[model samples]
Target: SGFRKMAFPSGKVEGCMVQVTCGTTTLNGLWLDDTVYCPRHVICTAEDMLNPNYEDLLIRKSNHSFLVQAGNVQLRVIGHSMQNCLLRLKVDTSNPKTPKYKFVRIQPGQTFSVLACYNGSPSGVYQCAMRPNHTIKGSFLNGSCGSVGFNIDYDCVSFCYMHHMELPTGVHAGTDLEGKFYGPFVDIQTAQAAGTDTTITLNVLAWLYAAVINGDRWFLNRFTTTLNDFNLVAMKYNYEPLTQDHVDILGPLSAQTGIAVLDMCAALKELLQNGMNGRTILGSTILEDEFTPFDVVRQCSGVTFQ
Candidate 1:
C-alpha cells in the first residue's frame, strides 16, 4: 500500500536533490530523507502526490511533522502546470502537538520540483498525515503574480555586497587585511529566535574589529568571501533563520551565544581564505559545547576562500 514514482520536469536548475524517510511529519517540520536528488537537473516537475494528515499543510507548528516512507521509496515530481503559474511546496510532520511546514513558491514559465526519498517500500511507515490539500493542485486561472501560488510565509532580507579585495574595514562586510565578511547564514528571522541574530552579527563584526585592532587574524580572502556569498545566495529561497526554533534548537555549530556566532564566522572566514567550501570549513557537525575546539560541531560545512 505505497505510492509509485516518476521523473522530474525538463530544463530545471543545475543542482537538484531529494529525500525520503520516516520523519516526524509536522507543518514546518520537513519529512525528507537525509539526502535525495532528481534523476535529471533540467526543468520543473509535478508528478508526486504526497499525503498529509492536515488540510492546508500548516507550517508554523512543530508537532505535526509525521512519518511518510518507513523504508526504501522512489518518489519524484515528473511533471507540472507551467501555464505561467505558481507552485507551493510544503512539509508535514508527525508530532501531535503542533504541525510545522516549510514552503517554497515557484513562478510560472519558471520551474519548481520535489524529489523522492523512498521507493514505495511500506515497511517504514510510522504515523503520517497531510494538510488541507496535500497537493497544491489548483489555481485561480486568472490569478495575479502574488496570487499565483501560496502566500509568501517568510520575509527575506538580502545583504547585497560590493565585490572588493581590499577587505572592508570599520564595516560589517569584513576586515582590511585582504579579507571580507563571508556570510549571514543565520538569517534575520532566525536571529529573532535568540533575541537578535542582528546582535550576533554585530558580535561577528566586532571580532573583525578586534582582529584588526590587534592583528589577531587576516580578513577573509576573496575566495572565502565568494564562498560565503554563494552560500548566502543559495539560501535566498530558504526561510529566514531556516526555522523559528533554529536558534533554540542549537547544536554545536548553532551556538548563538553571541560569542559562538562570531567565532564561528571568524574561523570559517579564515579557513576559506586558505581554501575551503562551506561544508569543509564548518565540518560535518558543529559541536556546541566548545563551539570551536571546545565543542565539536562541523566547521567543514562552511564556505571556502578560493
Candidate 2:
C-alpha cells in the first residue's frame, strides 16, 4: 500500500508513514493510533489542529543534555522552542540529600504554564535565538561531550491505556487522536499515590534516543570519563585489578561521534562481564540498558522529523 493520505488514519499502519505538519515542521509520521508520532517533537490531535490556539500546543517537550564526571553531572535543559507555549522542564538533580530543598526550573519557553504537581516542580520558560528544531546537544564542563539525552513531551491526563508505553509526559493530560495519552511523571509521586499503578509504562530514553541521534565522540568521553571515575572509586576498596586497559575502552572525539553505538554497548558489556559485584556507581546515573522504546521508532525505515 502507498502512504496514507488521511491525517488521522482509521487504524495503525504497520510500516506506512502518515503525513502531519506540527507547527511548521512538515514530515511523515508513524501512525500509532488516533494520532501521528514524531520523535523529539510534539504530536497533535484534531482538537488541537482546529483550535484557534493550536500554535500553543505546537511544542510540548524538553531535551536534557547531560555531562557526567567522577561524582559530578551537569545538565543543560532545552525546552521546545515556541513563541506561544511556555513549556518548562522542572526536575530535581540528585533527587535530594535532605527532606527540604529548592528545584531547578528550565524555561526554554521564556514563559509559564501552571499545573498542580505534588512533590515535583513545573517546567516552561526562556529566551534567545531559540532553536527551530527544538533539540539541543548535551555539553558538559569537561567539554562539549556525551550522548543519550532525555526528552520531556506532552501526553494524556486520564486514561492509563497507554501505560505500557514509554512516552514524554505533559503537565496536563489528554488523549491523542487514537485515545493514547501521556501524563506528568515524577518518581516520588508514583510512590506516594499508593495504588496509582503507573508500572513499567514510565520508562526513559537517554542512552538510546540521544546515542542514536547525536551519535559521536563526546558520547565516548562522557562514558569513558565517568567510567574512569567509577573504577577509580573501585580502587579505593576493591583494588585487585588496577589495570589501565581495563578502564579506557575508547579515546577522544577523533575516535567517534557525540553518540556512538558500537562502543556504548561494548563498554556496557565489559563492566557487566567483569562481575560488578558491589558497584553502587552504576545504579541510576549514566547506566545504559534503557534503550528499545525510542530506538524502535528511531531506526524505523519510514519515520522522519522534518
Candidate 3:
C-alpha cells in the first residue's frame, strides 16, 4: 500500500529515494544513501540515521545474504520482497551466558554444534524448522560434530572424557579383559535408572569409545586403527549395545553421523554400582559434554601406555 512520490534530480531513485518536488517521483526502500532526505535513509527523526536496525533492514531487503554469525548461531536472511526479508535468524550472540533464539523465515543455512571443525560445519536435529517465527533448542546440538555429533534424543545425558592413548598415571593395561586389560575401548552399557533419571529404560554408556581408541593429536589421520590388545569394560559385562531392533535406538555408527549418534536417557544413574578390576567404573570414568571422531581423549587426557 504505497503512493508513488517525487523523483530525484537525476530522474531516478538510487536506493531509498526522497521527494523535493523539483517535479515528480518518490523513493521506495532499502539500505541506501541520500543526504537529500536529511539523513540519507529516514525522516521525522534524524536519530533514525544513526540506528543500526534501520540500516540493517536496508541491507536485508536488498537480497538473500549470508549476513552474520556468532558463537554457534548464524543469520542468513532470505529476501522476501524489496522491503521484507525472511527473518531467518536474529542471533544476538552479544550476550554469552543467557543466549537467546528467534526465528522468522528460512530455508535453513543453519545448525547448532559444539565439537566442530575450524571450517563451518552443518548440523541438524529432528526437523530443524527454518520457515518463520519458529524456535529451536540449543540443547539439541550439544555434543555433536558434523564429522561426529551428540545424543540424538530429547533427554539423553552424555559425557565426554577426552585424552590420549596413554593410560593414566596410576592405571596400567593388563594381558586380559576382566581387570587385567582395560585399555581405551568404545562400547555401550545398559542398566536400570536409579536416581534422577526415571524416563529411560536402557542406559547407553558409550564413553565415545571411538575417541579414546583412535585419539591422536593428529588431524592428518582420519580413522582409528583397531586396537588388538586393548579391552572395553561395558562390552565385557555380558552387555550389548541397544540397537533400533530393540526398544531404544542410538542411530548408527558412521563417519557421517556426526560425533557418535550419542543417545541415552535416564538409565544408568549410579556408576559406582558397576564394578571392574581394582578400578571402580565410577572412579575411572570422566564425564564431559563433547567428543570427537579421533582418539582425542587418549592424546589429550591419557598417560603413555606402558
Candidate 2 per-residue lDDT over residues 148-248, each given as its tens digit: 11122232111111111111321222212232222332211122111122111101122333333332222222444344554454344322222333223
Candidate 3 minimal-lDDT segment of 10 residues: 172-181
Q: lDDT for every model?
A: 0.22, 0.25, 0.22
What is every candidate's alpha-carbon RMSD to the true fold?
Answer: 20.4, 22.1, 23.4
Candidate 1 lDDT over 103-217, as tens digits, reads: 3322111111221112321111111111111111111111010111111112321111111111112111111111121232211111211111111222223223223222233
Q: Which stretches of candidate 2 lie over 4 Å from their true place?
A: 1-174, 182-260, 272-284, 288-306
Candidate 3 lDDT by residue in tens digits, 1-306:
111111112111111111111112111111111111111122113343233344344453432322332234443333322112111222222222221212112212121221221222223222111111112222222112111111211222111111111122221111110111122221111121111111111222333323222331111123231221111322443233333433223223222223333222121222213322253222233332122212123223233211
TM-score of each: 0.19, 0.19, 0.20
Give candidate 2's error at residue 221 in angstroms. Answer: 12
Residue 143, candidate 2: Cα error in Å is: 40
lDDT of 1 at 70: 20
Report how far residue 144 has shifted in candidate 2, in Å: 35
How high is the lDDT of residue 25 in model 3? 15
Best by TM-score: 3
